[PDB]
Design a protein around this ligand. Structure first.
Ligand SMILES: O=C(CO)[C@@H](O)[C@H](O)[C@H](O)CO
Length: 494
């Protein structure tokens, strides 16, 4: 009879309730004759000052996230603990054979958000009728306080086993749109059966509407996913996504197709999806130079609408069946989405790529590094004719890319034009989701700041009206899509 212990490392926000600090698992139910179990724990004053109440939670489930995040799919009992106390006890008849125990807290109304605000606790002893059990730590507890923190899509939500692939969008009217792959049966990509789902917020991300499936997968080989979002200059919302067979299964005559859909009511309703594959490649393509290309997909997340009105996304395109590599081209529209063209090639052996507007009006491309090329660094390219043509810009390199989709934001910080870039820190793996600041004038990257430790993958980033960063990340091995709000001073001041 051993006891295994996991401290929580997920972010918190003020006034949240029943946040797990430490969870422990009995390897066996309490034996008959056992009457009581007692849990002694430690918790520093700095954490105690940040909480308003403590709890012992007991459940038949051993869950990854805070138990309220499973919205009742996890049932549990809650016994309060005085925040000044350091032990609690419960009869074996109350535990009722259950094996999983949580030390949880209600977060106070803290108002600091510096890097120092880290909550922690640790279980020191689990005793059954006075007989202390052996406890082994698999994880330490450290939960950082952010101005906002909320899991928008959690495994099991609405009957979908999994979620992946975040996209976020802020509209000129302040509406936030959050979309995701609804991965119904497992976490793998197309050709699995996948839907596109969405939640909206009309109060700057304080609260979100219930998820609505806006594009429905119709079976294996007939799913949809990899959403990217823009707002066009005329005000209509534009989403772009792929559907069908997997990327490497696509062919010119049986392609994984690219679709667009639009919204003229702040993301409440969306037009029926429109196949635009024929503009890009394949059997219906008017350019015979691309008749025999095999596959294309736009990087999920956000595109870019230029000052001219031109709408753009970077497609990553498979041109040859003899290799498993992709080339980047800009997919753009000068007519509010009515028609679409391709730029000249922007990057050889690229992958998911993102655009942002340089302070001089040039366009910067950030290209995912696939296959651990070169020094395993993020790739960059520049365009000075609004996306039509491109050249490598090593001058922007200098951050590691373990091979993952990220996002850029052009921000002004202490009077300096800078670029915020989100990527897993790694190294060489999907761990510790971070952001970096690139100072434009010096051409120097900051040191990374880890927003979310642990398993971390795709991220997308939006700038809120007052300059708070909205950061939408894939958290965990079984991924949750988590919306985090912070200001740049919270992460980069000393
Ligand atoms: O996988 C998970 C789920 O949240 C955790 O184990 C954590 O993200 C990482 O794996 C280690 O901290």
């Amino acid at each position: 009879q051993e006891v295994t212990m996991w401290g929580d490392s997920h972010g918190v926000a003020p006034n949240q309730v029943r946040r797990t600090l430490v969870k422990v698992a009995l390897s066996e139910s309490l034996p008959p004759g056992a009457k009581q179990i007692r849990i002694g724990f430690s918790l520093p004053k700095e954490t105690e000052e940040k909480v308003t109440a403590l709890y012992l939670l007991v459940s038949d489930s051993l869950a990854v996230r805070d138990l309220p995040d499973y919205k009742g799919r996890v049932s549990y009992d809650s016994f309060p603990i005085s925040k000044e106390d350091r032990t609690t006890a419960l009869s074996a008849d109350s535990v009722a054979g259950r094996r999983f125990f949580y030390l949880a807290a209600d977060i106070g109304p803290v108002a600091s958000f510096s890097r120092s605000d880290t909550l922690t606790a640790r279980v020191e002893e689990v005793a059954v009728d006075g007989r202390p059990l052996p406890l082994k730590e698999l994880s330490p507890a450290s939960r950082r306080l952010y101005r906002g923190y909320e899991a928008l899509f959690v495994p099991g939500d609405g009957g979908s086993r999994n979620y992946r692939i975040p996209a976020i969008l802020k509209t000129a009217n302040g509406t936030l749109i959050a979309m995701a792959d609804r991965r119904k049966y497992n976490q793998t990509d197309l050709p699995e059966d996948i839907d596109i789902v969405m939640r909206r917020s009309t109060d700057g991300g304080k609260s979100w509407s219930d998820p609505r499936i806006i594009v429905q997968g119709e079976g294996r080989n007939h799913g949809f996913g990899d959403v990217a979002l823009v707002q066009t200059q005329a005000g209509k919302l534009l989403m772009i996504f792929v559907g069908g067979v997997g990327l490497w299964q696509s062919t010119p005559d049986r392609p994984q197709r690219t679709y667009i859909s639009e919204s003229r009511d702040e993301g409440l309703t969306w037009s029926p999806p429109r196949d635009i594959t024929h503009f890009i490649f394949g059997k219906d393509c008017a350019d015979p130079g691309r008749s025999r290309w095999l596959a294309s997909f736009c990087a999920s997340g956000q595109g870019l609408v230029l000052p001219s009105g031109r709408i753009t996304f970077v497609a990553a395109i498979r041109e040859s069946g003899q290799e498993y590599v992709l080339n980047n081209y800009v997919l753009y529209s000068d007519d509010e989405g009515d028609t679409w063209q391709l730029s000249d090639c922007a990057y050889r052996r690229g992958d998911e790529a993102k655009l942002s507007l340089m302070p001089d009006g040039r366009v910067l491309m950030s290209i995912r590094n696939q296959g651990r090329q070169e020094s395993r660094q993020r790739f960059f390219a520049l365009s000075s004719d609004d996306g039509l043509t491109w050249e490598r810009a090593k001058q922007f390199e200098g951050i590691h890319d373990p091979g993952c989709n990220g996002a850029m934001l052009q921000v002004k910080r202490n009077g300096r034009d800078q670029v915020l870039h989100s990527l897993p820190l790694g190294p060489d793996g999907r761990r510790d989701g971070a952001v970096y600041l690139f100072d434009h004038v010096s051409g120097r990257w900051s040191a990374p700041v880890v927003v979310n430790s642990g398993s971390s993958a795709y991220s997308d980033m939006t700038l809120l009206a007052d300059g708070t960063i909205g950061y939408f990340v894939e958290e965990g091995d079984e991924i949750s899509l988590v919306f985090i709000r912070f200001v740049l001073d919270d992460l980069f001041d000393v």
